[PDB]
Design a protein around this ligand. Structure first.
Ligand SMILES: Cc1cn([C@H]2C[C@H](O)[C@@H](COP(=O)(O)OP(=O)(O)Oc3ccccc3)O2)c(=O)[nH]c1=O
Ligand SMILES: Cc1cn([C@H]2C[C@H](O)[C@@H](COP(=O)(O)OP(=O)(O)Oc3ccccc3)O2)c(=O)[nH]c1=O
Ligand SMILES: Nc1ncnc2c1ncn2[C@@H]1O[C@H](CSCC[C@H](N)C(=O)O)[C@@H](O)[C@H]1O
Ligand SMILES: Nc1ncnc2c1ncn2[C@@H]1O[C@H](CSCC[C@H](N)C(=O)O)[C@@H](O)[C@H]1O
Lengths: 239, 237
């Protein structure tokens, strides 16, 4: 699969907890970035919010937080995690919520699930359409082509509460994208062992392709390297 | 049936579990010499990929192996190019000679079904041991020590190749049903999934002792041993 559904969606949080992803830390850094650019910020929209881990922590920093997510199964986990937030089922390429926000964020390389400049431009225009004029757009990109490592293998095992999950991924270059194949073994005393597979195309947009998408949406763009996952961060300001 | 890529993964997965065949071979050679000081030949039954044999060849004059799986035997033959390895069945084989020691390690004996097959294997072991030699059998778990629902998971990397292995064990009549899955991944080879399922018989201690006695061997059990399952030794007479 490629749609973050079913068993894969239910394993997502445990797998990334096992890999060391710290959403509390990332949310605090993201909130500080937002407050640096929009010092009276009060509202945030997290696009491709997945299971809602960032939003759960951002709600402490901003009086209104909302989310948008394409996968119904991810969205169901996010809604249970964030019962008091308004979350939306929808597509970052075309959504329309009828309000604006101090910040529009798109984290953890979700933007790489778009194919081609036309989809990238359309998403960035939607983000610009949802940001207040004194607000900020934040996009965590995928790897740039010059930084991509073909043949990369990641392997990790986590156990929690009687469930053991092992995850192995392999990445290769496929045209202008990463082809990443992911396999899971899920095990437990009563349930036995189950095997699951995922296969994704994640687009290797160049730095200049990202900057063009921000520019076409009317945002001034800046790239900061490092960031939450080693891939840096883009910030866009209206005007 | 220990074939194909599963056979080729065996050594890497057991290195990752920390199985130390060099130390087991040293301990086994010392055990044999406690019961047979001038011991100079050894037969390893169900020798698998020949890891014990490779280290035991440093301690004995002659080492030979017996193995049912052709794919395992080929790895054993690559690793032990100067040894004589036999394609055959522990329940019914005849090499035409005897050995100071006949060994059957790592619970291979648990692939037999029922007392009759167990007895017949032990009789073949006794037929191949010298009158001053020793038979060594590492058993599978006894029923009272078997742990249903056990999950094992381990990952190892060697030469750029990563192998992850997960097993699940359950009770199936008087046997353990063990399901094993592997994920194998390397930079150029990509990622593949493999799986296998085995029935490993839960013989009681008294059943093992019955098989040794019927073959004319005095029998003693040492708990603990290379795998936590103990070791049986048998002496002719
Ligand atoms: C150091 C490094 C890694 N990778 C690539 C190689 C490979 O594609 C990825 C491998 O690691 P895994 O931990 O399975 O990836 P995630 O779960 O973080 O992927 C997603 C994250 C977010 C959304 C979608 C997917 O990083 C590079 O391209 N360059 C690098 O320097
Ligand atoms: C502590 C303990 C374990 N087990 C069982 C539970 C489970 O069936 C097994 C341990 O699982 P794994 O490490 O996958 O087993 P191996 O690869 O050694 O099995 C092979 C045996 C012979 C040839 C090949 C493989 O021991 C018990 O029954 N009791 C115990 O106290
Ligand atoms: N076109 C699209 N519109 C909205 N969400 C999308 C999308 N394409 C992929 N996604 C979502 O992007 C997410 C990538 S995983 C990242 C989730 C979350 N931001 C986190 O940091 O954990 C998945 O939940 C997937 O369903
Ligand atoms: N009837 C039989 N005769 C000979 N070998 C057998 C057999 N039944 C199973 N086997 C073998 O027993 C082995 C169990 S795995 C143990 C391998 C080796 N003794 C080691 O310590 O690593 C496999 O190689 C399998 O092919």
């Amino acid at each position: 699969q490629a749609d973050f559904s079913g068993e894969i969606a239910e394993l997502y949080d445990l797998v990334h907890q096992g890999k060391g992803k710290d959403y509390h830390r990332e949310a605090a850094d993201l909130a500080a970035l937002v407050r640096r650019h929009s010092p009276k910020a009060a509202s945030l929209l997290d696009v491709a919010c997945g299971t809602g881990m960032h939003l759960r922590h951002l709600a402490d920093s901003f009086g209104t937080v909302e989310g948008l997510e394409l996968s119904a199964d991810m969205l169901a986990i996010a809604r249970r995690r964030n019962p008091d937030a308004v979350l939306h089922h929808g597509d970052m390429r075309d959504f329309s919520l009828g309000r604006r926000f101090s910040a529009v964020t798109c984290m953890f390389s979700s933007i790489g699930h778009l194919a081609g400049q036309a989809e990238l431009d359309a998403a960035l225009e939607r983000f610009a359409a949802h940001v207040l004029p004194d607000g900020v757009v934040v996009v965590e990109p995928w790897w740039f082509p010059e930084n991509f490592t073909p043949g990369y293998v990641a392997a990790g095992t986590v156990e929690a509460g009687g469930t053991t999950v092992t995850r192995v991924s392999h990445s290769s270059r496929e045209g202008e994208a990463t082809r990443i194949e992911v396999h899971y073994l899920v095990a437990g005393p009563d349930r036995g062992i189950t095997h699951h597979e995922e296969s994704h195309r994640i687009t290797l947009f160049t730095r200049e392709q990202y900057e063009r998408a921000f520019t076409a949406a009317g945002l001034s763009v800046e790239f900061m390297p490092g960031g939450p996952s080693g891939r840096g961060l883009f910030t866009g300001l209206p005007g």
